[PDB]
C-alpha cells in the first residue's frame, strides 16, 4: 500500500481577520499529524498516535526549529515582495515530502509557491532548482551555489523522510493500515423523458483510494462517465460515485477486492 509523509509551510504578509502570519502542518497520507502556528508558537500533535508515541522532548525540539523557520519565512517573503515590487498581502508556501510506493520504490519532492503558484521546484536527481520566472531564477542561482545544502536536501528526501514515514506508519498502524470495505449501491432513474441515469454509489470506505467504472457488455464505456469526488464522510471514511446515461454493470476496486454490480 502507498504511503506518504509531507510537511507544509504557509507565510502571509500583512494578515487580516485573525489569520496567522505563519502555519506549518504535517501529514501522513490524508491525515494531519503535527501543527505549528505563529499564534500558539508551539509544535503540537494532530493525531492521538503521534501524541502517544513521541515524548515531550520531540515537541520541545521541533517547537524551537519551527520558531526559527517562522522567522526565515517572514524574511524570505519580504525579499520576494521586494524582487516583485509587490505591496500589501502576499503568500509564500513550501511543501516537503516523500512517498513509499507499492513496489518499494520511493519518491521525494521539495517545492515553493508564491501567491499559490509554482515558484521553485527541486530536482534531487540533477541537484537543481527549476525556476518559473526571473525572480525565481535569482533564488535558484543563490541556492545552487550552496552544493552541500543540495546534497543535504537529497539525503533528507531519499533517506530521512522515508525513515520518518515508516516510523509514523508503525505508530499509526491501526488507523493507516486498516481496510474498511465500501458499501456499494446502483441507482436507476428516468430523468428528462427518455433519458435514464445510472449512479453507482460507494460509501464507508477506507483508504480513500477507490476505482469505480461502468461497463457495457463487459467492455469499457465509450460514452461519457460523470465522476463524483472522493469525499470525507466525517467519521474517517469516504464516499464517491460514478454515473452514466443508458447490459450495464458497475465495477468497483478497493484494497485488492474487485466488486461487480450488474443492472
Amino acid at each position, epitope marked *: 500500500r502507498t504511503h506518504s509523509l509531507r510537511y507544509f509551510r504557509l507565510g502571509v504578509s500583512d494578515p487580516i481577520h485573525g489569520v496567522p502570519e505563519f502555519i506549518s502542518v504535517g501529514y501522513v497520507d490524508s491525515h494531519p499529524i503535527t501543527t505549528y502556528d505563529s499564534v500558539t508558537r508551539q509544535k503540537e500533535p494532530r493525531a492521538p498516535w503521534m501524541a502517544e508515541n513521541l515524548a515531550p522532548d*520531540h515537541w*520541545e*525540539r*521541533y517547537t*524551537q*526549529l519551527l*520558531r*526559527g*523557520w*517562522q*522567522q*526565515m519565512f517572514k524574511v524570505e517573503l519580504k525579499r520576494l515582495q521586494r524582487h516583485y515590487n509587490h505591496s500589501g498581502s502576499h503568500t509564500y508556501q513550501r511543501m516537503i515530502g516523500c512517498e513509499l510506493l507499492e513496489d518499494g520504490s520511493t519518491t521525494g519532492f521539495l517545492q515553493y509557491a508564491y501567491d499559490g503558484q509554482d515558484f521553485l521546484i527541486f530536482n534531487k536527481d540533477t541537484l537543481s532548482w527549476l525556476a518559473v520566472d526571473n525572480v525565481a531564477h535569482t533564488i535558484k542561482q543563490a541556492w545552487e551555489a*550552496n552544493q*552541500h*545544502e543540495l*546534497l*543535504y536536501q*537529497k*539525503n*533528507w528526501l531519499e*533517506e*530521512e523522510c522515508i*525513515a*520518518w514515514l515508516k516510523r509514523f506508519l508503525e505508530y499509526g498502524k491501526d488507523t493507516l493500515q486498516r481496510t474498511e470495505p465500501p458499501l456499494v449501491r446502483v441507482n436507476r432513474k428516468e430523468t428528462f423523458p427518455g433519458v435514464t441515469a445510472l449512479f453507482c454509489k460507494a460509501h464507508g470506505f477506507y483508504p480513500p483510494e477507490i476505482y469505480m467504472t461502468w461497463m457495457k457488455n463487459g467492455e469499457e464505456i465509450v460514452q461519457e462517465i460523470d465522476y463524483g469526488d472522493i469525499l470525507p464522510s466525517g467519521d474517517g471514511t469516504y464516499q464517491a460515485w460514478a454515473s452514466i446515461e443508458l447490459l450495464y454493470s458497475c465495477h468497483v476496486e478497493h484494497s485488492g477486492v474487485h466488486m461487480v454490480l450488474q443492472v
Partner: antibody
Amino acid sequence: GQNIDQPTEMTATEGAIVQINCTYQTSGFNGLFWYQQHAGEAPTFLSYNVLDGLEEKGRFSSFLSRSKGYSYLLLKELQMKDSASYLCAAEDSNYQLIWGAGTKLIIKP
Amino acid sequence: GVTQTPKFQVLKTGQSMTLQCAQDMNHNSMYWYRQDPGMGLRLIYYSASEGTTDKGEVPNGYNVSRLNKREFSLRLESAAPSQTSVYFCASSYEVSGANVLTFGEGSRLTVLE
C-alpha cells in the same frame, strides 16, 4: 543518536600521510562535519559529507561511508602546522550535533 | 564573525558572571558550548533564531538571553568550581542542514573557593 568515536591521539611524521577515523552510531543522519582546533584556539570548519564519497580540499580529504557509519579525514604532505585536535561531529535525525572527544594529532619533525 | 568576551576570568564560588557574544554574520542560530578534557563539546543553551532559546545537554547552573539577532549572553548566577571550563560561543545561519559553525575565541573560566 547515541555515540561518536575517534582515536584519542595520533602521531605521524612530517611529509607523510595520516587518516583520522570517526565512527558514528545515530538514529538518523543529516551530515558529518570535521573541525580543526589548534591548542588554545577556536575550532574552525574543515569539511562536510552527507552522501557516500571523498571530498578533496587541498592536502585534506574527507570520506564518508553511510552503510559502514564511518568517516575519515585524510591529511597528505604533513606539515608541523597540521599539529592540532581534529573534531568529528555528526548531525542526527533532529538536526542535533553529537561531537567526538577529538583526536590530538602530533607531527614528528 | 563571532566576538566573545572575556577571554579569561577568575571567580570566587558564589559570584555572578555574564559572558558576552556578538555575531555580525546575519546568522539566526547561536550556541553556548563548554569544552572539557577527554570529552566532546557539550551544548549548554542554544537560540534557533531571535526571540527564542532552549536548554542544551548541560543547562544547570546557567541561563541565557538572546538580546537581539546579534547577541546571545550566558549567565553564571552562582559560580561553582564544576563551572571551571573553556566556554565557546558559536553561530550558524540556521540550526538544521549543512550550515557551518563559526566559533568565538573562547572564554577560560576558573572558579575557586
